[PDB]
Design an enzyme around this catalytic site. Structure first.
Site, PDB file in Angstrom:
ATOM      1  CG  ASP A 188      -6.239  24.125   6.311  1.00  0.00           C
ATOM      2  OD1 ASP A 188      -6.741  24.569   7.710  1.00  0.00           O
ATOM      3  OD2 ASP A 188      -7.044  24.924   5.512  1.00  0.00           O
ATOM      4  CB  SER A 209     -12.654  28.102  24.758  1.00  0.00           C
ATOM      5  OG  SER A 209     -11.961  28.354  25.997  1.00  0.00           O
TER       6      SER A 209
END
Length: 330
Positions: A35, A199
């Site tokens: 994770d 992004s």
């Protein structure tokens, strides 16, 4: 040193991936959920409340000659999906894919919430976010990656998740045969303890690319792609019959519809998520309503590049003094 381990989807939807981890001496092998959105290595154990264990493999520290109680230490974690667990701590030898850390904090669950009990395939979590998120008190503990770092040939690990197939986590090296083209690296902020990056935009299907900054986290422990409501609405508007259902808890679409791809920007580079990756199947057995793999982050408080996005790429988690993230197509 290096390590290399295969990671395998837990079910036919890629809801999560499990990776075998050796703990203790002799080895006890548990299947953990790696994770990159949390920083605790915790396991179902001989100390877990019996009624909360249902099919999982447990770690029994009393059967490990190298286990030592980390005296006084406790831990307690809550995840974004509302799940939680807590307990005490041992140090022990932990190996992943041939890479061994001695003295790793292994957080033994005394209690786990129902979502964990109900998932027989996941024996615990192995956190790979920054150690500043680790919940052990009074002495915060380091992640497996942080402990391994100095021994690694290169201070990196990579996630190469499969679509409806196994993939690979590598530690300490970049497998240049595992991707196509070049790896584009992008800056990371560690301020929130996550692999947080920005992004450069998105496209829906064959549509024109929209240049826009989207801050989010690279999170192997989250199934879906969670993005701002504007972006998500623009995606689902291109799917015949799609709608956001408050009763279901997100966007659904008729299983008869074709899903467009979704492209996200990494610097000047582009990662294309195929439409098929965005299909999470019927909301309930036999239903013609399918659950979407791109959902709104509104009310999470952060955008999350979960498995839907990451499995479309070869991803480098660069833990150099100034951390960065790399993405390549594959």
């Amino acid at each position: 040193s290096t390590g290399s381990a295969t990671t395998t989807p837990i079910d036919s939807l890629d809801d999560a991936y499990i990776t075998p981890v050796q703990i203790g001496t002799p080895a006890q092998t548990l299947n953990l959920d790696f994770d990159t959105g949390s920083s605790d290595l915790w396991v179902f154990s001989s100390e877990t409340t019996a009624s909360e264990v249902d099919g999982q493999t447990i770690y029994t520290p009393s059967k490990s000659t190298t286990a030592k109680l980390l005296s006084g230490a406790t831990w307690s974690i809550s995840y974004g999906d509302g799940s939680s667990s807590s307990g005490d701590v041992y140090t022990d030898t932990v190996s992943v894919g041939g890479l061994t850390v001695t003295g790793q904090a292994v957080e033994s669950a005394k209690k786990v919430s129902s979502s964990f009990t109900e998932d027989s395939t996941i024996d615990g979590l192995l956190g790979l976010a920054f150690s500043t998120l680790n919940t052990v008190s009074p002495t915060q503990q380091k992640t497996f990656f942080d402990n391994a770092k100095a021994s690694l040939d290169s201070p990196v690990f990579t996630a190469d998740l499969g679509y409806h197939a196994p993939g690979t986590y590598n530690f300490g090296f970049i497998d240049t045969t595992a991707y196509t083209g070049s790896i584009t690296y992008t800056a990371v902020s560690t301020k929130q303890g996550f692999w947080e990056w920005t992004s450069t935009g998105y496209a829906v299907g064959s549509g024109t690319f929209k240049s826009t900054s989207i801050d989010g986290i690279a999170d192997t422990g989250t199934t879906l792609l969670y993005l701002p409501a504007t972006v998500v609405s623009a995606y689902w508007a291109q799917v015949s019959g799609a709608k956001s259902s408050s009763s279901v808890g997100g966007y659904v679409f008729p299983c008869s519809a074709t899903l467009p791809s979704f492209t996200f920007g990494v610097g000047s580079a582009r990662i294309v998520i195929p439409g098929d990756y965005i299909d999470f199947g019927p909301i309930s057995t036999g239903s013609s309503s399918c659950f979407g793999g791109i959902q709104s982050s509104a009310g999470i408080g952060i955008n999350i590049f979960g498995d839907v996005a990451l499995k479309a790429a070869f991803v480098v988690f660069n833990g150099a003094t100034t951390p960065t993230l790399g993405f390549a197509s594959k």
